[PDB]
C-alpha cells in the first residue's frame, strides 16, 4: 500500500529532524551536511539564511559552535503534513540547554521549527527550515556542569 | 496485516498527542477541537473536566489561554497499550514552560497524561485524557523572554 | 517489503527506550525487568555495570530509587542504525528533573544513551545500555514540588 511508503517516509523525516539536533550538539559535520538539499534554505531568525550543506557548515562552524562551550537540543512535538507523497510541511519544538562562551553563561532556549522536506529519487532531505527563538533565558545563578 | 494497521494507528495517535499540545501552545482553535469525540472527556486535576470539542474550546478560551501570556508543552515518552484494534490506553510525560499572566511569573510544570484513544470509522481521536501535575514551580529570578529582552536593564 | 519488519522493529525499540524511563520514574519493577536480556549490560558512568533483568532491579532498588524522592526522565532524539535485521545501535538524549534525598535538592541532569538492541526469536530487548551524564546541576532557589505546596 501507500501507507507503508508513508510510514517509511515519517521514519526517514524523524531521522532528519533528530540528525540535525545530534549533529549540532555532538559537532558532527558529515551528519549535519547530509540532511540538506543543495538548494535548501536554513534560516535562524536574528542570524540569517544559509543555503545547502555548505551553508549549514558555515552557520555551524562560524556561529553556532563558537557561540557555545556545549549545548543539548531536545526535539519534540514533530508534526508532519504530507502535501504529497514527496513533500511534507513539518512543525517542531526544541528545548535547548547550554553554556554560552560569552559570559560563560548557562541559558535555556525554547524555539519553534517550521520545516519543509522533499523526497528526490527515493531520498528525503530538508528543503527548508525556519527557526524562531521564543525564549532565550540566562539562568540567573545556576551553572550547568558535569558531575 | 494488522501489523501495518498497528503501525499506522500508532502514527495517528502520536499526531493526536502532539496536536493537543501544539493547539494549546499555538492557540489554534481548529486543531484543538478536531482531536476529540463528542463524548470525549478532558480532565486536568485542579482545573476540572470538560467534554467534547466545545468543552476543549471552553477550557482553552476561558482558562488556559487567559492563564498564560504564552506557554510551551514538550511531550515525550508516549507509550501505547492496544486494548483492541480500535481502543488504546496511553501514558505520556510533558514538560511545560510558560509565563503566568497573574504576576507575569515564569513557571515549570511536569505532568503525566493518562489517555484513552478511540477509532470510529477509520478515524482516531481522544476518548479521554487525564492530566496530573507532579511539579508546579514558579521560577526564582528567572523570567522566560524573547532574545531581545536581553540587553534591556 | 520487510520495511514493515524494520518499521515494526523501530516501534518495539522505541517502547524499550520509553519503558526504561517510565519504569524508573513510576517505580515499576515489572516494567524495568522486562526490557533487558539476561546477558544485558546496563552501565551508568560514575556508578557501575549491572547485568540482566536482575542487576537492573539491583541498580534500581539500591541506587537510583533510594537516591531520589521522585524524578522524571524526558527522553528525546532517539536515532537508530540497523547493524543486522536483528541487531541495532541507538543513541538518545535525556532530560532528567528530580529531588535528591541528599539535601532535598532539586537537580537537572542531561545525559546521553549509547544503546544496543538485540532481537532473539521475534522479541526485541536491550542487549546493552551506556548512560553518560553531561550536566548534573543543583538548581539554586528552586524546589520542585506538587502544586498544593505553593499554597500557604
Swiss-Prot record, chain C:
Catalyzes the conversion of the important environmental pollutant gamma-hexachlorocyclohexane (gamma-HCH or lindane) to 1,3,4,6-tetrachloro-1,4-cyclohexadiene (1,4-TCDN) via gamma-pentachlorocyclohexene (gamma-PCCH), proceeding by two successive 1,2-anti conformationally dependent dehydrochlorinations. Also shows activity with alpha- and delta-HCH, giving alpha- and delta-PCCH respectively, but not with the beta isomer. Is involved in the degradation pathway that allows S.japonicum UT26 to grow on gamma-HCH as the sole source of carbon and energy. It is found in: Periplasm. Belongs to the HCH dehydrochlorinase family. Changing residue 115 to N: 73% of wild-type activity. The lineage of its organism: Bacteria, Pseudomonadati, Pseudomonadota, Alphaproteobacteria, Sphingomonadales. Is not N-terminally processed during export, so it may be secreted into the periplasmic space via a hitherto unknown mechanism. Changing residue 67 to A: No change in activity. Optimum pH is 7.5. The active site is at residues 25, 73. It comes from the Bacteria. Keywords: Detoxification, Lyase, Periplasm. Disulfide bonds: none annotated. This is Gamma-hexachlorocyclohexane dehydrochlorinase. Signal peptide: none annotated. Transmembrane segments: none annotated. GO terms for molecular function: lyase activity. One of its GO terms (biological process) is response to toxic substance. InterPro entries: NTF2-like_dom_sf, SnoaL-like. GO terms for cellular component: periplasmic space. Induction: Constitutively expressed. Pathway: Xenobiotic degradation; gamma-hexachlorocyclohexane degradation. It catalyses: gamma-hexachlorocyclohexane = (3R,4S,5S,6R)-pentachlorocyclohexene + chloride + H(+); (3R,4S,5S,6R)-pentachlorocyclohexene = (3R,6R)-1,3,4,6-tetrachlorocyclohexa-1,4-diene + chloride + H(+). Changing residue 25 to N/L: Loss of activity. Changing residue 144 to L: No change in activity. It comes from Sphingobium indicum (strain DSM 16413 / CCM 7287 / MTCC 6362 / UT26 / NBRC 101211 / UT26S) (Sphingobium japonicum). The gene is linA.
Amino acid at each position: 500500500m501507500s501507507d507503508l511508503d508513508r510510514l517509511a517516509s515519517r521514519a526517514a523525516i524523524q531521522d532528519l529532524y533528530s540528525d540535525k539536533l545530534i549533529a549540532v550538539d555532538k559537532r558532527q559535520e558529515g551528519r549535519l551536511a547530509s540532511i540538506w538539499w543543495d538548494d535548501a534554505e536554513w534560516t535562524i531568525e536574528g542570524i540569517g539564511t544559509y543555503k545547502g550543506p555548505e551553508g549549514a557548515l558555515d552557520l555551524a562552524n562560524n556561529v553556532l559552535w563558537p557561540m557555545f562551550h556545549e549545548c543539548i537540543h531536545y526535539g519534540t512535538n514533530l508534526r508532519l503534513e504530507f502535501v504529497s507523497a514527496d513533500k511534507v510541511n513539518g512543525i517542531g519544538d526544541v528545548l535547548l540547554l547550554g553554556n554560552l562562551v560569552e559570559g560563560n553563561q548557562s541559558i535555556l532556549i525554547a524555539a519553534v521549527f517550521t520545516d519543509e522536506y522533499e523526497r528526490r529519487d527515493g531520498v528525503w532531505k530538508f528543503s527548508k527550515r525556519n527557526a524562531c527563538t521564543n525564549y532565550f533565558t540566562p539562568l540567573a545563578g545556576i551553572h550547568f556542569a558535569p558531575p
